């Protein structure tokens, strides 16, 4: 069974740091592009960052470029989001979201309301 469980998060002050984790199991981690997505209180799901299978093609939403650093450990099946210079606007539940199919460059449904290959999340409060 495909399971994503996000670790980390909590309460920090503006400008503080935080390191989120994603323990994956139930699929060959190395074959999938991974995503971090978030849902601010009140608003819909918003894409934050992604990373290719090898960890070479990285991308970020504009609001977090320079602050967040995505990374993946393919040996230990873990995804990371080092969050620096946190702002109150970063407050949201952050979800680990896997692209739906392996060995692909199109990664469609990761911000859908219901999406199967996405963890429960983790509350980050700033």
């Amino acid at each position: 069974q495909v399971q994503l469980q996000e670790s980390g998060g909590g309460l920090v002050q503006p400008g503080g740091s935080l390191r989120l984790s994603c323990a994956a199991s139930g699929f060959t981690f190395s074959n999938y592009k991974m995503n971090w997505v978030r849902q601010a209180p009140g608003k819909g799901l918003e894409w934050v960052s992604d990373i290719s299978q090898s960890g070479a093609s990285i991308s970020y939403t504009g609001s977090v470029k320079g602050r967040f650093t995505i990374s993946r450990d393919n040996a230990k099946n873990t995804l990371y989001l080092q969050m620096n210079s946190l702002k109150p606007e970063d407050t949201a539940v952050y979800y680990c979201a896997r692209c739906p199919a392996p060995f692909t460059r199109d990664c469609f449904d990761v911000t859908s309301t219901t999406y199967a290959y996405r963890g429960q999340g983790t509350q980050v409060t700033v």
Binding site: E46, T104, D106, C107
Partner: peptide
């Protein structure tokens, strides 16, 4: 950020193997 959501959608469409 709807423009960035539109960008992700366009990207997936542009890179989908059946829509190439």
């Amino acid at each position: 950020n709807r423009l960035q959501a539109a960008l992700k959608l366009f990207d997936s469409i542009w890179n989908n193997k059946w829509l190439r």
